[PDB]
């Protein structure tokens, strides 16, 4: 109310822990007790791209400017 800051009563709002596998996370959370919500790891998708099908003959893939 005097300075305009983020006055918070949260000691545990500024922690982040770096793990290697999900098993280490589960073992750590059950070791130190409090509840956990584990999201699933969502990798990228290896997608096929090709310059010839980019610039083919009778397909609809035609950039028309480059």
Query: Which stretches of the chain bind another protein, using CB under 8 A?
Result: 3-5, 44, 46-52, 54-66
User: At its nearest, how many Å lie between another protein and the CB of residue 49?
Assistant: 6
Nearer of residues 34 and 57 to another protein, judged by Cβ:
57
Torsion of CA 15, 22, 25, 8, to 10 degrees: 30
Question: Are the C-beta atoms of residues 49 and 55 closer than 8 Å to each other?
Answer: no
What six digits make up the tokens of 47? 């997608």
- The nearest distance, CB 63 to another protein, in angstroms, is 6
- Indicate the residue among 22 and 62 with the shorter CB distance to another protein: 62
């Amino acid at each position: 109310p005097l300075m305009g800051w983020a006055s918070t009563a949260d000691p545990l709002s500024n922690l982040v822990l770096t793990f290697s596998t999900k098993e280490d996370a589960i073992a750590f959370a059950e070791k130190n007790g409090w509840s956990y919500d584990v999201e699933e790891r969502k990798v990228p998708k290896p997608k096929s791209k090709s310059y010839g099908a980019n610039f083919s003959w009778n397909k609809r893939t035609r950039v028309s400017t480059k």
